[PDB]
Amino acid sequence: GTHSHGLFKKLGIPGPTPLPFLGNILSYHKGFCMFDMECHKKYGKVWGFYDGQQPVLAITDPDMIKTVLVKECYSVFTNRRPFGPVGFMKSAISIAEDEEWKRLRSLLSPTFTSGKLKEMVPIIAQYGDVLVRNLRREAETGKPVTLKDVFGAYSMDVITSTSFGVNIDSLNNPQDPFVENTKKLLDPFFLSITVFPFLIPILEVLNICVFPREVTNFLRKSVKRMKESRLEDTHRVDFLQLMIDSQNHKALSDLELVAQSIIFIFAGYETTSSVLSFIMYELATHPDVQQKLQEEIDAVLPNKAPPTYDTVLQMEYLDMVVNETLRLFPIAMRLERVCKKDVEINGMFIPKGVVVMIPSYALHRDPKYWTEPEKFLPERFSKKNKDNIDPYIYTPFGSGPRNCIGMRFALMNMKLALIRVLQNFSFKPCKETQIPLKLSLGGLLQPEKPVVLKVESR
Amino acid sequence: GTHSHGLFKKLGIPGPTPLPFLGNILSYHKGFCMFDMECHKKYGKVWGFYDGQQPVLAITDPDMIKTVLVKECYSVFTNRRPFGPVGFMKSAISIAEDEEWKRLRSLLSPTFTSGKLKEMVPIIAQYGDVLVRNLRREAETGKPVTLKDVFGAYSMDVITSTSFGVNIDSLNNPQDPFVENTKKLLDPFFLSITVFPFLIPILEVLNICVFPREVTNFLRKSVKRMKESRLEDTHRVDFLQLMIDSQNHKALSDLELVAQSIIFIFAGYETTSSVLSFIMYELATHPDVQQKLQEEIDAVLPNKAPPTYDTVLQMEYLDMVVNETLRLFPIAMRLERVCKKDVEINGMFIPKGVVVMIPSYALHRDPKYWTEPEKFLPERFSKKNKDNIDPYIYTPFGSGPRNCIGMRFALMNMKLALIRVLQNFSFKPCKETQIPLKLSLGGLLQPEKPVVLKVESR
Ligand code: HEM
Ligand code: HEM
């Protein structure tokens, strides 16, 4: 019941009073983000709460965040919180722990270099043209457009060609065997898990694998079909080939190959589609920002020139818009590390087993570091003001050795979509648009209502 | 079902074919020991089997046993197999893992030194006189005596005075609050656990603590009564004081104090009582050995002189009888270590998670190292033949940093009992005696029938 619920009281750490068994999970009715901002406002820099029987310690001090994410990563704070039923996804880089994660991290790090990203921008740019082609149709209909569907179709077209080389227009091909099996996904079982963590091993013995054995065998058989058709018949630049070439520490196995590719699919579809919808909402509700970005894009790229890797990294106002949107909407919301052993960081005793949490959403809106946090102001990230941003308060991609390994890929992917879309269209709020935007009440950072806007042709 | 049952087939390791879910647990119908000897005879030096879904690898090569128990103890083979419902006994030295065990081992190692054992032999010898006093009564009745009851009463009298200083004659005091609460213990739930390991965390949330909350609070309140009555009112030589003094790495906590004392109670009652019964069986069925031991005891100790610490370690034939009995009856039966990470020891790939097992019982009776293993021959351990015994085939107390920390205490305790008993009595087989002795069919090394013998007065 209250087995470990007296931990934070024994250490003198404040926090909301936990209920037996449940802990503080009932305080999630307002959302992960609202619960973090209220605890930050009512407890100061450090507080604690319980996800069931699991004690969670939240820290907001910049030096402690640097100590947890960077200084004591390999020694104390290496792994993340486990785990609903895992299956074979234990070999996933974002799920692996300790030395197995370090092996996968070092094996997949050369894949996400800027040199390998630069070789992927011709393929990613191809579907930017496909994106505006499906947007040209939905704009000429003369009625609001749900940005979740055109960005989700674009985000999948990028992740299928970059991870496997499969080149399909998803929006106009409702069912290419590959598209549908990738669409087979995916509350309130997640809160049941956090309050019944002892029932997780039972879902392993009942062979209740979280992923359908049909799609799993598909991707596993689709990959082995690709590995066999390419060895040898008879130069490719996808994530699969970059991992196949690395197989010739110890090399990755064939099942480990499937595990990482499933990660990138989950990593690209949810995030890039949601962040692009957040950006277009801010661009539509701030037409002055949208015009200045279009004026910059027209300058570096004359007469709608095709965006390239070097021309994307030259646009400063584009990078300022992406960073300011990621401040208001950090899709990860939280950063988490498990304390492997008893440690003393910056004057605090952190006992073993406690989950250290970085409230990234609450830090991005804390009035102590941000002037008028609720407003979309891209000028915070200009070269004049960029210096005075603490890189441990603003952590949209995390920090330390276990930060987002696909940060460069995600930034390049979203910018290539924003450029081609803004070169052809302008976006204004319609009457179905939710103004102001409300966040989802669930456990995902997504708009409560799908973003609908007007789309004109330039 | 057969999730990891194909592990030993992938590594080319022989072993009995496992059944789905059950594995090889049905082969335990003949006993842990018979199953190890059959697998040793039918597979050679190395084989594998499954306790449910848990793969177990047995090794019999001396160099590999030394590598697992000594060379790669801290690095690879540090912890033992876990764990039915634990409760607060996670702080037990024999259950603790990794650095927490090393902390408890170094904190309790100075307690089991020969200097501290030498200061305990006057108190242990007091109950040797109590042992012969209760044996003088049960011998004058002129009928067979169950050695389990007089040795169990003696073994408890030693463990209560050495661990807490409580001085009570257990046999004639049926219920001293302390005696009974120590007698509140304790199949087929153990095999249910090995086949349902996922149900162990459920016994933790149901507050089904394996130890009754009544006796547990008793010992916890009995210890705090002793710690408070001794601090200060107002020189003691028990295990509790040796651990109380060590509290003034990091010092042991009050709950950690109770955990280790519970270990010593379980460690002393079952073993010393059972081994003494095994010794007296061999002494009775080999009267030539019993006479030569009594002739040696009468030499060093004239006219039944009181045995002392120095006089015990002088008796060679007494040490030869104890060692030969521990060969035929190693009460631990098996030595186990968990492989923490992928390692390559002496030409073998040991994957992570595999339990490495040392069949101590089967090694002590292997005809390759022992001539006529089934016969009780103390001359194997004479100074002439003692050199040619491999210390990794004969491992009655284990080996390496995690061997039996109470080996010296157990050897001194049993010898002090054997001396005082053999100084006064002789032992012959009666008609109720099970000849030849059969081992228990269960999961404990104890006689199938309780050892009953004739007891005469000298
Ligand atoms: C807007 C897009 C994205 C954002 C904002 C984002 C953000 C994050 C954050 C905050 C973390 C956790 C960092 C930490 O715990 O310190 C993370 C982890 C990770 N991300 Fe991303 N991510 C994005 C897209 C992607 C993409 C497209 C990929 C791959 C194709 C990717 C791959 C990963 C991986 C593998 C990890 C775990 C790294 C590890 O455990 O070593 N992410 N991401
Ligand atoms: C005839 C009596 C005894 C025998 C044959 C015996 C044998 C053993 C064996 C074989 C092990 C495992 C070694 C390994 O895994 O390598 C062990 C462990 C242990 N024994 Fe004994 N034992 C006896 C009595 C005792 C007594 C009386 C005590 C304490 C009062 C004791 C305390 C321990 C402890 C604490 C461990 C675990 C050590 C650790 O995990 O670090 N034993 N014993």
- Indicate the radius of gyration of chain A in whole angstroms: 23 Å
- End-to-end separation of chain A in angstroms reads 63 Å
Query: Which geometry of chain A do the CA atoms define?
Result: globular
- The succession of helices and strands of chain A, N to C, reads HHEEHHHHEHHHHHHHHHHEEEEHHEE
Instruction: Give the total of beta strands of chain A.
Output: 9
CATH class of chain A: Mainly Alpha
CATH superfamily of chain A: Cytochrome P450
**CATH topology call of chain A:** Cytochrome p450
Strand order of the largest sheet of chain A: 1-2-7-4
Q: What's the tally of helices of chain A?
A: 18
Strand content of chain A: 5-15%
- Oligomer class: homodimer
The molecules bound to the chains, other than polymers, are:
protoporphyrin IX containing FE
Largest interface: A-B, 11 and 11 residues
Largest sheet of chain A: 4 strands, mixed
Helix content of chain A: 40-55%
State the secondary-structure class of chain A.
alpha+beta
Cofactor (chains A, B): heme
Protein name (chains A, B): Cytochrome P450 3A4
InterPro entries (chains A, B): Cyt_P450 (IPR001128), Cyt_P450_CS (IPR017972), Cyt_P450_E_CYP3A (IPR008072), Cyt_P450_E_grp-II (IPR002402), Cyt_P450_sf (IPR036396), Cytochrome_P450_3A (IPR050705)
Subcellular location (chains A, B): Endoplasmic reticulum membrane; Microsome membrane
